[PDB]
Amino acid sequence: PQIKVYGLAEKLNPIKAELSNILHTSLIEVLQISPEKRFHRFFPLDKLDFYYPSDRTDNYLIIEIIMFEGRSVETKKQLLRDIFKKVDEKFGISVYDIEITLFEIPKQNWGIRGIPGDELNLSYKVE
Amino acid sequence: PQIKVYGLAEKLNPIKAELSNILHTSLIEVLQISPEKRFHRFFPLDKLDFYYPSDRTDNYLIIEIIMFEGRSVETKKQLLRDIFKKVDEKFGISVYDIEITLFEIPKQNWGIRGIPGDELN
Amino acid sequence: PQIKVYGLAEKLNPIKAELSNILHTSLIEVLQISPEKRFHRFFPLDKLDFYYPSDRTDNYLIIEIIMFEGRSVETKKQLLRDIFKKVDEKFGISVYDIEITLFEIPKQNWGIRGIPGDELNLSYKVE
Numbered sequence A, C: 001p002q003i004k005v006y007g008l009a010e011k012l013n014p015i016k017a018e019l020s021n022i023l024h025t026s027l028i029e030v031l032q033i034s035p036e037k038r039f040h041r042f043f044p045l046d047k048l049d050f051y052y053p054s055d056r057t058d059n060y061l062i063i064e065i066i067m068f069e070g071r072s073v074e075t076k077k078q079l080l081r082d083i084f085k086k087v088d089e090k091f092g093i094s095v096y097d098i099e100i101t102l103f104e105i106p107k108q109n110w111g112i113r114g115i116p117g118d119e120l121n122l123s124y125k126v127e
Numbered sequence B: 001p002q003i004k005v006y007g008l009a010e011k012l013n014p015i016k017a018e019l020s021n022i023l024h025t026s027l028i029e030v031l032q033i034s035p036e037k038r039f040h041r042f043f044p045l046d047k048l049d050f051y052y053p054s055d056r057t058d059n060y061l062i063i064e065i066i067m068f069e070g071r072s073v074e075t076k077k078q079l080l081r082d083i084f085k086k087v088d089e090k091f092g093i094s095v096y097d098i099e100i101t102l103f104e105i106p107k108q109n110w111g112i113r114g115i116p117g118d119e120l121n
Helices: A011-032 A074-090 B009-031 B073-091 C009-031 C073-091
Strands: A004-007 A038-046 A061-068 A098-105 A111-113 B003-007 B040-045 B061-068 B098-105 B110-112 C002-008 C039-043 C061-068 C096-106 C110-112
Touching: A004 C002, A011 A038, A011 A074, A011 B110, A038 B040, A061 A074, A074 A098, A074 B110, A111 C073, B003 B009, B003 B073, B009 B040, B009 B061, B009 B073, B040 C039, B061 B073, B073 B098, B073 C110, B098 C039, B098 C096, C002 C009, C009 C039, C009 C061, C009 C073, C061 C073, C073 C096
Parallel strands: A004 A038, A061 A098, B003 B040, B061 B098, C002 C039, C061 C096
Antiparallel strands: A004 A061, A098 B110, A111 C096, B003 B061, B098 C110, C002 C061
16 A cells, blocks of 8 residues: 655644554554555645645644555455544544545556566455 | 645646635535535646646646545536636636546545545435 | 656656656557657655655655556556566666556546547547
8 A cells, every 4th residue: 555645744744754653553453464565655735735624723634545456345444443543542633634535446557566466466465 | 525736836826825716616516515625735846847748838737636436427527617617717727728637436435534434424 | 648756856856857758658659649648747755755665775666647547458567567667777776666556537537628538539549
C-alpha cells in the first residue's frame, strides 16, 4: 500500500513523523504487510489551498491509501477502524476530523521491481 | 465529494478562492450534497512541474473529483457540463482549457466520522 | 493519459525535464496516443515528506498514470515494462527504485474540451 496524507501545514508538520509510524503500524497489524514496506507521502497544505467544513477543526486530516485490490470487506473496514482508533488515541484528533479513502488497484495495473504486480510472489496474502 | 484542483500557480492563485465557491455551488446543485460539505485541495504548480499540450493555454485547469460510487451516468455528465459551464462563465476560461476526472470509490472503501461509508445515514 | 510523478526534490528536479520526454515516448510507442497529448505533473517532495523502505534509495520514483479504461492486459503490462526499461537505461535508476500505478477511469467519468469522454471522437484507439 501507498499512503498519501494531506493536512494543514501548521498542524500536519509537527505530527507527521509520528503519524507515519502510527499509520504504518496499522497496515502491519491489519494487512499483515512486512514491517519494512512503508511508502508514505505527506502534503502539508497552505491555509489558502485547503477548504474543509466550518464545523471541523484545522486538525482535519485526509488519508488516501492506494492498495492492491482483493482484500475482504471486513479487512478493509477493520483497517479504517484501526486507523481511526490509533490516530484519535495518539493525537487526540477526533474521528470527525479524519477522513480515509481506499483506492483499490488490480495487481496487473501496478509495476514493482520491473514487473507487473500480478507476477510478484508476495510474502503475505492479499486474500 | 473531495475535489483536487491543479493549475499554473500564477493563474490558479488569483482565482482559487472564487473557484472554490463556484465548484461547491455546482456540486451542491447537481449532486444535492448538503451545503456545508466543502472539501477542496488546491495544487498551484510551478511552470517546470506542469506539462500540457500546445493547444491548451496557460489557463489549463485539472479538476479531480473523488466521490461515492452510485450516481447515474446522466447525473455525472450533468456535473461535468455544469462545471464546464460555470467556470467558463465566471472566469472566462475556455472549456478547451478545463479537464475534469471523476474517481468513483465504493462506499465501503471510505472512512467518514469513524465509520465505513456504506454504514452512514 | 495523465501522469503524476513523485520523487525527492533534489533527485527529481535535475531529471524531470528529460524524464517527461522519456515517459511521453513510452506512452506514444505502447499506447499509440497522438504525440501532442503530453499531460504531466511533477511533485518534487521535501525529505521530511517522503518515506520509502530502507532497501530503496533516494532515487525512488513514483509514477501514477490516470488513463481511459479499455486497454488489454497485455498492452498495459507492456507499458509498465517499457517505462521501467527506458527510465533505467536513460538515468541509471535501478528498476527497484521505480514504482508505477495505472488508475483506469471509464470514459464517461472524464470531462475533456467541454464534453464527456465517451462522446469524444478520438484521433487514436483506446482499445
